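Recap slide: Ephrin type-B receptor 1, sequence and predicted structure.
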Amino acid sequence: GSSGSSGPSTVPIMHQVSATMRSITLSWPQPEQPNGIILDYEIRYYEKEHNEFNSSMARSQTNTARIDGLRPGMVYVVQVRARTVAGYGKFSGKMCFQTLTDSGPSSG
């Protein structure tokens, strides 16, 4: 983001709670400088190999949402943003969340 209109704050980091083989659960803290009322929280996920262009977007009515429609044992770059009546906010710290692996992880 650059030379853009002043938008709402953004989450510093993202915290995960759980995840499935065909989905993933995540969570993020609520900002203090939302520059207004946070309508909803939008999220963007895409294949670590793929780019933004070909990505999926999904918002929620809370600071907690889960992504459905993923492959088992695959990393997915998920991000959360803050949207308000004023405009869209920047994305939170980039994170990589992978799904469950049904292969048999020796160590981890």
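The two ends are 36 Å apart (CA to CA).
The beta strands are 15-19, 23-27, 38-47, 56-60, 64-68, 75-84, 88-91, 95-98.
(End of recap.)
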